[PDB]
Amino acid sequence: AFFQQQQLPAAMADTFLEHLCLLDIDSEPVAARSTSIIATIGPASRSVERLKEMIKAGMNIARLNFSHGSHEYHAESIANVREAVESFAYRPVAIALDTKGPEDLPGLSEQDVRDLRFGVEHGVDIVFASFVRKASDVAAVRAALGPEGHGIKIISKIENHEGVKRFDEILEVSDGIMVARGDLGIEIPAEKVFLAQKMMIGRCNLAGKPVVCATQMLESMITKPRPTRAETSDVANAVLDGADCIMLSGETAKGNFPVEAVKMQHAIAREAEAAVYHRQLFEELRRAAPLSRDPTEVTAIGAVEAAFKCCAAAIIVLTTTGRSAQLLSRYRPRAAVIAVTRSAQAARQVHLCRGVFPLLYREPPEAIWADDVNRRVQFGIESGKLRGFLRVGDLVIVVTGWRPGSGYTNIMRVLSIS
Amino acid sequence: QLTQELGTAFFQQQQLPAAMADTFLEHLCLLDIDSEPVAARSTSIIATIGPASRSVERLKEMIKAGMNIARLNFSHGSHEYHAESIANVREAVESFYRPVAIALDTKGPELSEQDVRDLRFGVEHGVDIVFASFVRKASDVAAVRAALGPEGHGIKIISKIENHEGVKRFDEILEVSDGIMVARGDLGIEIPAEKVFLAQKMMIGRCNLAGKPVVCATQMLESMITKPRPTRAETSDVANAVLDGADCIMLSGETAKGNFPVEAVKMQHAIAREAEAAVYHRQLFEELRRAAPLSRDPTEVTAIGAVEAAFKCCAAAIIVLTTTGRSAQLLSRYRPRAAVIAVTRSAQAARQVHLCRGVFPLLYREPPEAIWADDVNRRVQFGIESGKLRGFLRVGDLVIVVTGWRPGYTNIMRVLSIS
Amino acid sequence: FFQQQQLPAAMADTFLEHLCLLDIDSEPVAARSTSIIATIGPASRSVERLKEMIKAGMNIARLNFSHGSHEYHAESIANVREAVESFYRPVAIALDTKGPEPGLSEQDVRDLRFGVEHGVDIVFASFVRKASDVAAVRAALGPEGHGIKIISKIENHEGVKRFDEILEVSDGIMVARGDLGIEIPAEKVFLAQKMMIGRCNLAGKPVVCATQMLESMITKPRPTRAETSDVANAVLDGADCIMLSGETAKGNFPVEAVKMQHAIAREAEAAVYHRQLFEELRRAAPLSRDPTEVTAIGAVEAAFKCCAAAIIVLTTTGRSAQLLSRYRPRAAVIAVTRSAQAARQVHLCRGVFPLLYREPPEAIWADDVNRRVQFGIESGKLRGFLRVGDLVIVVTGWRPGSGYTNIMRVLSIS
Amino acid sequence: FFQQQQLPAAMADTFLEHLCLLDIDSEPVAARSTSIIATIGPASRSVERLKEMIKAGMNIARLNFSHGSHEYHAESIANVREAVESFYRPVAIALDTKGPEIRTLSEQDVRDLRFGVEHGVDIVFASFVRKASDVAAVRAALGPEGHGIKIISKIENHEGVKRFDEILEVSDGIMVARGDLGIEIPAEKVFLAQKMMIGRCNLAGKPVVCATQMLESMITKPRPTRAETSDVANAVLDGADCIMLSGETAKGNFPVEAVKMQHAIAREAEAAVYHRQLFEELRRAAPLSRDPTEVTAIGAVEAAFKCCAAAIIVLTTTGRSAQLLSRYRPRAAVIAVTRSAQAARQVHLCRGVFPLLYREPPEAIWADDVNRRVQFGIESGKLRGFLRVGDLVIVVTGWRPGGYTNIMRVLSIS
Ligand SMILES: O=P(O)(O)OC[C@H]1O[C@](O)(COP(=O)(O)O)[C@@H](O)[C@@H]1O
Ligand SMILES: O=P(O)(O)OC[C@H]1O[C@](O)(COP(=O)(O)O)[C@@H](O)[C@@H]1O
Ligand SMILES: O=P(O)(O)OC[C@H]1O[C@](O)(COP(=O)(O)O)[C@@H](O)[C@@H]1O
Ligand SMILES: O=P(O)(O)OC[C@H]1O[C@](O)(COP(=O)(O)O)[C@@H](O)[C@@H]1O
């Protein structure tokens, strides 16, 4: 019966067309949902109590929209998110600051600059930078974040024709991308936006950088408890296109059904994830990926190949900054990527990456370093057992380094859960 | 090379850089918002008739915007109400040549005594197509062909898949049906809403394999009922329906009762046109090949060679002589980039082929030529003349011409240069 | 049916799996399609020997002008023509020049004049290093020799490196493994063979594999295991023609050598993995607005769809037949021509079976076309290509004269 | 770098395009990986001569029990072992049974097999295997002291070809014995049997030998024919782990040159392997595996390709972890470190495995024992030309001593 679930008949098909023909509404998803949910905070979702239900429903990243609301307002939003998250101390939740932006203007307004200072002063994990048209706009955001905000991920919002055309140069200096379809479908003809979305997600997947699909994904749930047929389609297709993250704006910020909307995005994403045709996707991401002399990159593809060969339940990776986890996620394993880290910020930021489940390790270093490695891996296993990822008799891939400190992942081991 | 013959923009347009990519992923990465779609929109648009779309004046606007099939929803309105809808559709058509098919969508359980009277009414008024509600098995469609009776033998039956049993018994339904509607409205109530995309993609895929029309239906541009522009999810839905493989896309309340029926039709046409250029034919044609069975049907054999020929030379169009439409369906199933211009003497076949993606019907109304061979060539020039006027063909284009040797015997392909 | 000519292996989904399904019990049924070139010499000169060799499968007779006087080769030519006329299989006559032993020697020029005056069909030009070597040959053949196919022999390092400019201006290529394996290290020749055949297939231009294919049969009645391997693999690499030199020119078993090449080729041809090969030749091939090329691929696609027995093509110069052959149909290409020279030259193209039509033009052209197609069918029946009920593709044109092929028709045999 | 070892052809998108990119100026860099089996006889029995042959690349000495007394073969064994010791160069020793034979499992074969155990042969080539029980008769003959001897079944007739799958199931490997096969079945069908059996062995991960007349003419000539070099190259391209010499080394006048010629051809052909297709096709068809050694191997091989790893260093006791690497045909050399002298000789049956006998008392700490073998691996590879400083290598080891290979590490050579 294992082979009846999570669309494995379809995953085994020999062509894409045959894989489509074998999709089965009776094949239940079993894997953990892997596409992260970004929920925009507003009057419908500011309260600590609302945020707790949203966390339980699946929210992974809380978006602050600085197009509206004072610093004081956003400061309250941030504190309420942190209090909701800590009420479960457990789900790390990242905090993303989405800039007001231009409204050939400069890459940053005076308002933008003050807003990014605020976000650094408040430890935001992510910036969604508006109206990025060229790499210098990204550099401008980086500089305004200044020295204390070097670890903040910059996700460039592509919102107009120029940003689409200069995409390669924007992507190169950015940590990731948002397909900002709201403004995009005003700035270019609305019937073209799906080409820009598909193009940008394809290119981000190739580059191993996170990509966010945003705006009106479940629009009618602002007023209705259930979405339209086009809205469920759009969520599922964003996941099939390759998006790491899917986003809610008014559905959570102001609508009448914020929690049901998060839950609806979770339910669709899980079905869509199981329908991904990994056989074609992994092979193309291989052929099109370049040779690397980087041991983390080399170890990562070896581990994903290995995971596919034994239907591994998970890949446990010890990571300090999230990078080794990102390099696993870029090959889209079906196996869950369980990222054990000591860094609370990296546990939050890896939610930018499809299929990465962070575990914040809070135990004091062991004297023998190799003993500390194994204790974190064990932490990894036990948490996976108790959270549903792992059963005794499962096979996991463990991915670790030869010495302490970031940059030295280079070891892959195959392990049975007992 | 071909740049001289066809132009220097030609290969910039139509997403052709993405089309010659070696992998699906590289194809996605090469999609280009500045590659204008030159080809004629090929996915048919079904528009549900209601208060917003009953004016003869309105219907003519809708035809111009791209409506190809008028849907009559027998869930509401008397026989007299629907007779009038049929009447106004036919007058808009003749008061202009673009055939519009007329489809009767049964009430079903809300085959009832009511449905039988509705189907008899449909034959009486010469409907081209029945959308049969809640087909759960093959016998359900036999009940429908029986109701249509002897006078209704040429009516196409498109089975609406609306619940779990329909999805589960899909293969036996498709065997006995002319086509399928993925009826997402009720399906999304009868099964969990988050599974409908699985049922949609499976059904469009299997219909594509079987060479039968498939319609994607319901809430595609819903917000346009009250808004002049659609949501980002709605445009996405239309585009992916076309990329999924759908022959037809549908509007319900958007045309039946909304305030922007004409703008909705126009928006589907614009999305469908972009999406069709973005189809990765290299993979699709190859998978349709490897899966489809060997065939000793000469018309089937000619069509695949004709489509292959069309791709080798960037044929502007495949002109096919068809009596029932079948030869044009068998071209359509290989999804040429070239328009399939189908010349037929059968006004009904001409209306019904709108169910098949990429078929542009041309009704020919001249008495046969004394010499048949002369009758063929005359219809073919009619195809070419109509094609030139409508912007399909220019002098110097290449076309593929598909005819027969005897007067269901299509079995000749000819490569022809437009004078 | 499906336990013959490796069809189980043909259906396989990958090359690995096609190989695993090759079956020594699956008998070939299609007519042998790779043409056999036999070098004429003391063992093969007599009319009586040439008749046994035609029966055995020789398609092209090679005159090696490294030895023998004009009188000697004139005798070889006349003996081939008498053997051929004794029957019916057209046999081409190919003049293989002496060459440098300076593009063209004075000797080469006299030899080429001789071959033109004697109506030879093909020239194997020795030591071709660059496009100008081919042009020289072409000029030496002069005006009366415009219709003679030039097959450039690649025999050294420069020729391999400059292969693309040689291939562009040549009708075809010979992998002249004899001198090549001396000019470059012997352990590399297989690379130059595979590259050049691959490139000739992509270009749709005939390629010949030559030299030592069955060498030990010069003295022995049976070949070695490496020799059968080499023939089978030349066919699987993509060669249009395979060649015999000493095996037929001077050895003790000329006829058996031809018979052995025939038997191997037939088995190898059935082992061709068309699924992969057609798709790759379709993909790599370039868009074309030439109606003959468009019709040809459409016709080969159609033939694969209905397991067609043959593609009957009407051709004047052979070109429409070459453009079919370049997609390697499993179906036999039956080329109906009035041109005796074209019926001989099409033997350069894998899988083309010429039929010389000698009947008088019908007054109504369209009647002449149908009579030739029918000629094609009846001969196909009598010769074993076609059973009643088979399906054939017929490829013809819209107007008289070459260059106008543009019609394809699907026909059932009755 | 990327101009050598046919790397431009390696990154082609299609097989046909890969053929078109093969390049006679792309020199091989990797170590020759296909093993060379040399039959021992009067031309190749002297210790001096066997030494020259080992330097030329012989990896396996074949004893043909069709000819010569037990004493004759005891001396052949003696001289191979002395040549090996008088230099590290593990040479396997294979006993090829007489089997059902007629000259100008028998009682004789059993005495030969028992003699083989007595003298510690590593491999048996079992003649005329027709079915699975025949292989069981041979492992019975070898008895309890012969349990580690590998049994390579010779397929020599129609019945063995037909029952091949059951033969392969129970055998350690296969020899395509083309000599007798090409008399028992039509000669023109042997290439089909060869290609199938190499394909099925490749799929099964078991070694396959191509044998007989590969360089036959070198018995009397110092240079091979063009069909012979072709046949060696195609056997390597077909997927053979081992290529063999019979009369060319046993009785001919150029044994050393024959070995050298096979080494040179094998090296070129191995670079011309289109790994992208092969690795991909081996993936799809090979089954989901829950064995940690198989999982590590495929992950190690993928890793090796991602970084152009010069070597995969594996610690192995029986050879198995190295065989499971070798079945994916890495371009990187598989350097197999083992304490088992007999494992080290036997792994030569597996393409691309370079054994290293490690001779040191275990270290106090097991983890310390592992890294000393790994370092022994790196130092040998450095000395032998496999590794340079700054290279990347993939290291495969286990978690517990004793079928527990389950770790790969990426390591930069310093
Ligand atoms: O993903 P990153 O940031 O490169 O971290 C990976 C690092 O984590 C580790 O596995 C453990 O390092 P620490 O014990 O110092 O936390 C290192 O061996 C490895 O270099
Ligand atoms: O698509 P269909 O219904 O099979 O039509 C194909 C028929 O059209 C034709 O081209 C023309 O037929 P008619 O002129 O008799 O109407 C026939 O040759 C062919 O049999
Ligand atoms: O292969 P080629 O030399 O172009 O010949 C093809 C020609 O044969 C024909 O079918 C017959 O032409 P003919 O009447 O001159 O014999 C032409 O229609 C066609 O153009
Ligand atoms: O390939 P094999 O025969 O299964 O041996 C691999 C074994 O070698 C090792 O890497 C080394 O351990 P040993 O000390 O027993 O040689 C084991 O951990 C591993 O299980």
The full set of domains in chain A, from first to last, is 1-32+273-418 (3.40.1380.20), 33-104+108-272 (3.20.20.60)
* Shortest alpha-carbon distance between residue B209 and chain C (Å): 16
Give the strands of the sheet with B317-321, arranged side by side. B359-363, B339-344, B317-321, B398-404, B410-417, C405-412, C391-397, C310-314, C332-337, C352-356
Residue with tokens 């595609």: B220
CA-closest candidate to residue C103, choices C143, C145, C132, C124: C132
Type of residue found at C271? A
CB contact under 8 A, A413 and D392: no
CA-closest candidate to residue C121, choices C82, C98, C91, C97: C91
Encode B390-414: b = buried (16+ Cβ within 10 Å), e = exposed: eebbeeebbbbbbbbeeeeebbbbb
Note the Cα B148 to chain centre separation in Å: 23
CA distance A317 to A336: 10
On whether any CB of chain C is under 8 Å from the CB of B296, the answer is: yes
A321: annotated binding-site residue? Answer: yes
On whether any CB of chain D is under 8 Å from the CB of C323, the answer is: no
Asked if D125 contacts D95 with a C-beta cutoff of 8 angstroms, the reply is: yes
| Burial class of residue A126 (count of CB atoms within 10 Å of its CB; 0-12, 13-18, 19+) | buried
**Annotation: binding site of D for ATP:** 64-67, 103
Residues in B closer than 8 angstroms to C301, CB to CB, are: 304-305, 308
Residue with tokens 């040779």: A291
What separation in angstroms does the CA of D400 have from each of A97, C20, D375?
Answer: 49, 38, 19
On whether any CB of chain B is under 8 Å from the CB of A30, the answer is: no
**Annotation: binding site of D:** 62, 64-67, 96-97, 103, 154, 156, 179-180, 212, 316-321, 366, 373, 400-404
What separation in angstroms does the CA of B416 have from each of B6, B364, C312?
Answer: 15, 21, 21
The total number of residues shown for chain B amounts to 419
- Residue with CA closest to ligand 3 atom 4: C402
Type of residue found at C127? F
Element containing residue D306 per DSSP (H, E):
helix D292-307
What separation in angstroms does the CA of B220 have from each of B217, B237, B240, D86?
Answer: 7, 6, 11, 83
- CB proximity list for A118: less than 8 A, separation 6 or greater: A71, A74, A75, A97
Type of residue found at B211? G
What separation in angstroms does the CA of A187 have from each of A102, A161, C140, D90?
Answer: 14, 7, 67, 72
CA distance D168 to C54: 44
- List, in sequence order, the alpha helices (H) in B15-137: 16-19, 24-30, 56-65, 79-94, 113-124
Q: Which of A23, A203, A233 is opposite residue B29, by nearest beta carbon?
A: A203
Q: CB count, 10 Å around CB of A378? A: 12
CA distance B184 to B160: 9
Note the Cα A175 to chain centre separation in Å: 12
CA distance A244 to A34: 8
CB contact under 8 A, D299 and A298: no
CA-closest candidate to residue B190, choices B103, B106, B248, B109: B109
Angle, vertex CA B300, rays to CA B298 and CA B304, nearest 5: 115
Residues of D identified as active-site: 62, 103, 154, 212
Q: Which of C306, C407, C409 is opposite residue B296, by nearest beta carbon?
A: C306
CA distance A401 to B201: 43
In terms of phi and psi (left: phi > 0; alpha: psi -120 to 50; beta: otherwise), the region of A16 is alpha
CA distance A155 to B13: 31
CA-closest candidate to residue A213, choices A237, A180, A260: A180
Element containing residue A305 per DSSP (H, E):
helix A295-309
- CB proximity list for B245: less than 8 A, separation 6 or greater: B204, B205, B207, B208, B214
Angle, vertex CA C80, rays to CA C74 and CA C84, nearest 5: 145
Q: After what residue numbers is chain C broken, C–N > 2.5 angstroms?
A: 87, 101
What separation in angstroms does the CA of D313 have from each of A307, D316, D324, D352, D396?
Answer: 21, 10, 13, 12, 6
On whether any CB of chain D is under 8 Å from the CB of C286, the answer is: no
Counting DSSP H helices and E strands in chain B, the numbers are: 19, 13
CA distance A414 to D133: 37
Type of residue found at B122? G
Q: CB count, 10 Å around CB of A223? A: 11
Type of residue found at C322? Q
CA distance A212 to A60: 13
Q: What is the DSSP code (8-state) at residue B223?
A: G
Asked if B301 contacts C306 with a C-beta cutoff of 8 angstroms, the reply is: yes
CA distance A202 to A242: 7
**Resolution, angstroms, 1 dp:** 2.2
Residue with tokens 């219809």: B379
Asked if C261 contacts C242 with a C-beta cutoff of 8 angstroms, the reply is: yes
Q: How far apart are the first and last CA of chain D?
A: 20
CA-closest candidate to residue A354, choices A332, A338, A371, A375: A332
What separation in angstroms does the CA of A84 have from each of A93, A249, D60?
Answer: 10, 20, 71
Grouping H, G, I as helix, E, B as strand and the rest as coil, residue D35 is: strand
Phi, psi dihedrals of residue C96, rounded to the nearest 5° = -105, 110
Angle, vertex CA C375, rays to CA C370 and CA C377, nearest 5: 95
CB contact under 8 A, C295 and B309: yes
CA distance D193 to D158: 10
Residue with tokens 């018979």: C259
Asked if C73 contacts C279 with a C-beta cutoff of 8 angstroms, the reply is: no
Asked if D300 contacts D321 with a C-beta cutoff of 8 angstroms, the reply is: no
Grouping H, G, I as helix, E, B as strand and the rest as coil, residue B374 is: helix
Counting DSSP H helices and E strands in chain A, the numbers are: 18, 13
Ligand 3 center to C396 CA (angstroms): 7
Ligand 2 center to B409 CA (angstroms): 6
Q: What experimental approach yielded this model?
A: X-ray
CA distance D235 to D269: 9
Residue with tokens 């088992």: D340
CA-closest candidate to residue B360, choices B418, B304, B318, B303: B318
Q: Which ligand is nearest to the CA of D355?
A: 4
Type of residue found at D247? G
Asked if D129 contacts D103 with a C-beta cutoff of 8 angstroms, the reply is: no
In sequence order, what are the beta bridge partners of B130?
Answer: B104, B157
CA distance D139 to D124: 10
- CB proximity list for A281: less than 8 A, separation 6 or greater: A332, B25
What separation in angstroms does the CA of D378 have from each of D306, D385, D406?
Answer: 20, 10, 20
Asked if B258 contacts B224 with a C-beta cutoff of 8 angstroms, the reply is: yes
Work out the angle between the directed axes of helices D292-307 and D275-285 (0-180°, nearest 10).
160
CA-closest candidate to residue C333, choices C320, C316, C317: C320
Would strands A245-248 and A211-214 be described as parallel, antiparallel, or unpaired?
parallel
CA distance C218 to D269: 29
- CB proximity list for B50: less than 8 A, separation 6 or greater: B73, B253, B255, B256, B257
Q: What is the DSSP code (8-state) at residue D274?
A: -
CA distance B178 to B156: 6
In sequence order, what are the beta bridge partners of C58?
Answer: C36
Ligand 4 atom with the smallest distance to the CA of D322 is 1
Residue with tokens 């290969």: B11
Q: CB count, 10 Å around CB of A392? A: 8
Tokens of C145: 């020799």
A183: annotated binding-site residue? Answer: yes
On whether any CB of chain B is under 8 Å from the CB of A179, the answer is: no
CA-closest candidate to residue C149, choices C2, C318, C296: C318
CA distance C393 to C379: 15
Q: Is C405 in the pocket of ligand 3 (CB under 6 A)?
A: yes
| Burial class of residue D223 (count of CB atoms within 10 Å of its CB; 0-12, 13-18, 19+) | middle
CA distance C253 to C250: 9
Would strands D392-398 and A126-129 be described as parallel, antiparallel, or unpaired?
unpaired
What separation in angstroms does the CA of B63 have from each of A190, B53, B266, B342?
Answer: 22, 11, 10, 19
Around D334, how many Cα atoms within 13 Å sit in the side-chain half-sphere? Answer: 33
Mutate one of C3, C6, C24 to test the D interface: name it (highest D CB count within 10 A). Answer: C24
Ligand 3 center to D60 CA (angstroms): 62
CA distance A200 to A158: 9
CA distance B260 to C83: 84
- CB proximity list for C97: less than 8 A, separation 6 or greater: C65, C104, C108, C111, C112, C123, C124, C125, C126, C137
CA distance A201 to A209: 9
